[PDB]
């Protein structure tokens, strides 16, 4: 049931049906904190980092072709989802990510040994440190995997979902471009704008956010690998850093480059602090959009009720028309989460010392969570709410013609002071605008219905 | 004034304005920390003066400081407390992290002024000395945390708690006045089963009562004072009774229950009492945000929103959109509640960042803490007098919304059965009818039966 | 492989080997956001809430004994860990927690049906809404489960671990009460204190934190159950609210009470905002303690090096004595997490509207995570670091006698000005205190070794 | 002054101080929002004056405002910009959430002053009118966000970016000066393989260069101006060229690349540009915290810490502990970096909280944003001139730590083999010896061989 594996501290029992080794087993004894583990995206990024290092070590004559090929095949198995239960370590581990680095070194070594016709354990043919970790430190591997995971998740999950939601809202803005509704400022009745114009604000927000996120990508694409322990690259080949960044760029099809300054790359999480700044901006924009949708849909009788949204959940038959805006609630909740995650990231990023920032597992846990939340949240909100937004045209028109600020249209005809008098009149008593205007003899009713035209008041 | 006076410290001489009472170390800090515009708040300056006044009294009691000097120092401190020397404290929040520079600012101003009170002069011929006399038995390391806690506890007791109690009382009066006004409930922003306006306001009242208790629970820790720990917490070379005596003297002159900190190492190395007390303040900010939002949403309109209540109209804006009045008290309150949340993060970072024997994030921690107390106290005071005391129901609008909603339909269940009641609600919703119109259209009851059976006052409990 | 279950929206396929129903299945379609699910503590609290409601409904004659007993037995199976895979829903769901409430209603109904000799599915003998949810709303059930989970986790996990760590540090403070070391303020050489005194500061911090956490418990013990949809308790028995709080108190052995104001209980998360305030205070204290430990242990040659800590991880044989303070790193990282979690909670708690706060899954996700992190982190730091803190007595004494601030001891003998002169002398040149004092003739060397006694300088 | 002048708005008459230039709406705000002490910063007041000056010019160009009135309004605005009217702006941050009250403050002051410039008087007989003239073509809803962006962009361009560039240059000079000084590395706070002091500082330089680029990427969005959107974003009843013309005029008078916002609905409904730009500022705060901490830790001592570098000694403290000087510039910087983090949270909450056509958390957002810019700009300026320009290595201490560490042992591997080198390191660690002493004790090499083989200058790359 168990196997005895060894490190420099001695022997330790490891489950026979697992591929990790002594160091992973010790971490399981020493870091039994909560339930958060490395996410799949990070495990995959670590496997890609080892795959690239193995290829470059082979190219430089430092690692045999048979070992380099077996390591790459084992890494491909991780990427293919064959070893998810081989990565049991907590986020709340050593702050450099050493334990997860060793987790990957041990799993890949034991598995590559089997691929070469050998066995897992201390008789293995491939060695976690001398082979899988060759030319590397935990110090430069872990920030490399952080940036690989972050850049790929932004490119493959978040940005596509952001574009998809933007396109849906752009279509809605065009479809509702002629529907005049009442504006609200301070929650109070204002002047008209079209529903398409209001939605066009949401679209412009999402377009701006995309640009801000795109501006953060070049820094995230810079990789620490090759800085080794403290940034000098001592005892590495002078071409290794460029070569491994090039290999990661080839195998991921993403524009990874070696970090021009390895001291900044090891001592900080600055690229992720900055990139997460753009994500909390997106969270603030999505919060506003989600709130507008649920407030506009509120009712069906005692709120605003200007739009309808899809009803996705069942309800009591005695309560027809209570449609809780549950996609909006999920989205607003995750936006709060992103704001909190930003604070955790900022504290970790502010807290480097000398040659190494050792808040890294926590920083990447928060960062990748925010990406998942925003990407999946935008997908969910798009599919289950935004694509189905529809106007309640009768309710929109009823509210539009209730606003006393339609009196704006009378300025050019009878002057601001008499328009302000009609509005103050209708407000002080319980009268409409036209009832107030006719009681003052400032115009005829035909003059009113010809001059007060909301469709002419939207620019 | 252009003319200068030469003041000296152990590093040499520096020119200070001739018309000012500070000395060399104040001038060095003023010149070396030209960072933004935030200065020590008056509450903290007063707390520093109180600290020096108490130390002078105790040093005299113990025979360490002459009556003549101790009395002059206390007289100078009383001038500061009376508001006669606000312009003598020019230093930034963004100074040394222990607040040494503001400690020295008080030492220098009080020494120069006490010298004048003894018939002497300000400057290097002074009769009273900032270090040997005004700072006797003290370090910046125990003085500044003491002033922080004195300022914080007095602000909580004298400003925040009374304003919280006043706002709670007003809302309790409104809850009682509106106890019989049934309105539509809202959950998820959707129409829901009814409750009274008084019941809804009673929730706000209960929130403020709970917040008061949480704040009260934080006060004993803030009442613990570092004074007597001196440089590292050991109290080296101070009188064994000094720490208790100075806490007792501060308790006397402030009428507040200050005590000496039982562990001076915790008192110097952390801002933990303020981190915890600010936790209660951010709780209050979250409650006040919710109350303020309920008020402005319920008041929204006057025609295109909810409009269930009216609030006082206090100012117009620009002439564009004539007669439009906004819930500006609610907005000021929601804005300051956001500020308190951000201040909590800054405080938490400073509080988490002590090293060894001293936390040196102190000016920033106390700047944020006292700001949050001002914002919450003054904001509650303003919201109360300019909005809450004048909340009124719009009874016709409340009834219109309630009676035109679908949420009174369950009152029909006992009379006609669930199935017919649900059929009525479904028809009303699909066809845009009131429940009464749908029920009459189906022939399931008479108008008189509907009016007799559908009683909102029977659907809210007691 | 599948079963057809129904709700008011129609039929939907549910895995035959699962116990949930139509509403849980729909939630799995509509809320596919990230990976965070309800934690076990919350699932168990929900099961306890249903168990108590079933007992009270039976006592009041509203639910048959056979159904109430079967529901309680099913709930006990959940509490016994027999149904962990029956709760698949995301945190990022409806903001009231309706979906997880229905998840529990459906699992308990289908299972209780089997316990009565029936089947799962639409032919079941126990019904999720009419039976398992009787007298309840999602609106009052979910905040009840939040408070049950929070109070029990504070009482059973966090507070015991806090007391355990405090006791360890108290023992260390006593053991090192006579070891004089150099104080540091602003990172600079100060006057002496004992190592026991310095550790006594950590102890006092943890004692204060315990009191603050204890002060938060009475509010968390107040339960919303019985407020139903909006707080009025419409269509419930007048004794139900008190009875169900009493039953929860009996079955948990914790002092639960019914909330005196159900409107505050439904419309806010205030008790948890306040309780989390105490937890972020503990995080700030633990951060400081952990930082003191790792800085005091830094080295072994180019830092402070005043204490040693256990070495739990292997290292390269060529690098003996590099002992990374990995427990300190895990602890400081989770303290940053708690600070971020506090911001997320504060935003959710500030964001209630009218009768209901609908940020609840996110609030409780963060709150229970902070409890796990702090409780498990204190356990880990205690077992794997704090219990093994030891002084490096030679290094402590070497640094103690290096500080020029030992010149303080000369004030009472030769006066402050000449003491300040000796210190300014030793600082300006490259001399010790005694070399400077002898070169000035201010004292003999016997006078120096008799007057400068650090053990006499600690109070 | 006790004497009053009666000023009027649409709600009635109110007394204002006779010696002040503001009007009825300023007085109502002053009296109704007595909340704490934070007021509009001078940068924002100036940005409001610039906005009014540009609107007056464009309104004149379009034939909507007489030359005589437009010129007098611009003259009054120039007086504000010249610092002649700071005491005329008494309003709190904690006012209406749109900033209407400060919009009206500028309208009233400029109208009353422009009236005087035309030979008229202040008050209700004035010749120039706050609403019809100074606010022509405008709403508070587009004026306040415009002033926010004008103040923010100018502060970033004129204060923050130049100070960031200056500090970067200083640290680059230090990196070059110390390029040959090998020191011990530290990872996890533990002794690690060596690098040069110049390499370590080059990390700080690279951090500041990256931060500059991130800040620069945020500027185009802040340059977009809401002016022309009026009340809800439609620009109802304004000239079709007004929005472009006023952005062009602001670009001319500020020499900054302002443009009209392509979507006025986004510009009114959000503070998104400032939420994003502040994200870059909190990134800079995290970098500066790390740099400041490296400096104070490396300078720590002078005898019981690290002590690898020396920094300027700028002030003493109190006489207790004589001659002890603290890294006070580092402390001010770390404190303000904490402040920026908290300010980010307050900004994010305000930015997330818009509703419908207008975000009404604006005074609080801009208060925090401009504070962070002042803190970071002035803090970098202060840290540079009072600390960074004077960083110096303690060469003997650096060499002592390096040579007495265990981390040079790998230099022996190629000469005696890994196994003997590891044996030497293990013996040195267990017995408290230097590597040289352990190697000699084992008889594995000579002292001359050790000195020849163990070359730190060969262990740092290039």
From Swiss-Prot, chains B, D:
Transmembrane intervals: none
Pathway in which the depicted protein is active: Carbohydrate metabolism; tricarboxylic acid cycle; (S)-malate from fumarate: step 1/1
Binding-site residues for substrate, renumbered to this chain: 98-100, 126, 129-132, 139-141, 187, 319, 324-326
Biophysicochemical property: pH dependence: Optimum pH is 8.
Free-text disruption phenotype from the record: Cells lacking this gene show an increase of biofilm formation.
Catalytic activity, as annotated: (S)-malate = fumarate + H2O
GO annotation, biological process: fumarate metabolic process; malate metabolic process; response to oxidative stress; tricarboxylic acid cycle
Any Pfam family hit: FumaraseC_C
Catalytic site: 188 (proton donor/acceptor), 318
InterPro entries: Fum_hydII, Fumarase/histidase_N, Fumarase_C_C, Fumarate_lyase_CS, Fumarate_lyase_fam, Fumarate_lyase_N, L-Aspartase-like
Mutagenesis or variant effect for residue 126 to A: 10-fold decrease of fumarase activity
Regulation: induction: Under conditions of iron limitation and oxidative stress.
HAMAP family from the UniProt entry: FumaraseC
Family classification: Belongs to the class-II fumarase/aspartase family. Fumarase subfamily.
Binding partners and assembly: Homotetramer.
Name of the protein in its database record: Fumarate hydratase class II
Organism field: Escherichia coli (strain K12)
Organism phylogeny: Bacteria, Pseudomonadati, Pseudomonadota, Gammaproteobacteria, Enterobacterales
Gene (name only): fumC
